[PDB]
Design a protein around this ligand. Structure first.
Ligand SMILES: C[C@]12CC[C@H](O)C[C@H]1CC[C@@H]1[C@@H]2C[C@@H](O)[C@]2(C)[C@@H](C3=CC(=O)OC3)CC[C@]12O
Length: 157
């Protein structure tokens, strides 16, 4: 119960880091079930947009999905639009970046109407270690909205 909490996205997001391979190292279970396990995505800059090609295993079957990403308003604010096309159905939406160091990791959040929350953590490496791990932990302890106990970490074995 409750409406979506008011989110305070970052003020320093660097869109130039939005390229290359990002591994989805953690997420809430509902996200893993809906959008799949073993998730990774390749981001390819195309002018003002970035193209997103994503792999995951959904209900035991592998899929690639495709989407386009654009910043909404000032790119520094970390409010990002993605379209998301899989199995011939397109969806679209806006999510907010809760935390990033503009180098190793990004934490994304989406909330819809009661209300359901989804959080996912992306990294340039398959495993969150050192610097990135420490930043993520500190963020979680002060975070008004992410429940750290609910995160499930990925097993890329
Ligand atoms: C914002 C979004 C838009 C489509 C749908 O409404 C669901 C929401 C929440 C979930 C969100 C999609 C867009 C998608 O592109 C995502 C960002 C997608 C991911 C891409 C990625 O690198 O990590 C996750 C899986 C699902 C996703 O996390």
């Amino acid at each position: 119960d409750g409406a979506c909490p008011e989110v305070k996205p970052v003020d320093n997001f660097d869109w130039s880091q939005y390229h290359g391979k990002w591994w989805q190292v953690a997420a809430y279970p509902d996200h893993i079930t809906k959008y799949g396990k073993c998730g990774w995505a390749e981001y390819t800059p195309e002018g003002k947009s970035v193209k997103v090609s994503r792999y995951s295993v959904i209900h035991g079957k592998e899929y690639f999905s495709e989407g386009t990403a654009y910043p909404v308003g000032d790119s520094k604010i970390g409010k990002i639009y993605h379209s998301y096309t899989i199995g011939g159905v397109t969806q679209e939406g806006v999510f907010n970046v809760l935390s990033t160091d503009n180098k190793n990791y990004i934490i994304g959040y989406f909330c819809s109407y009661g209300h359901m929350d989804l959080v996912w953590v992306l990294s340039r490496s398959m495993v969150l270690t050192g610097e990135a791990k420490t930043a993520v932990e500190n963020y979680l302890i002060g975070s008004p909205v992410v429940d750290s106990q609910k995160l499930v970490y990925s097993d890329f074995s």
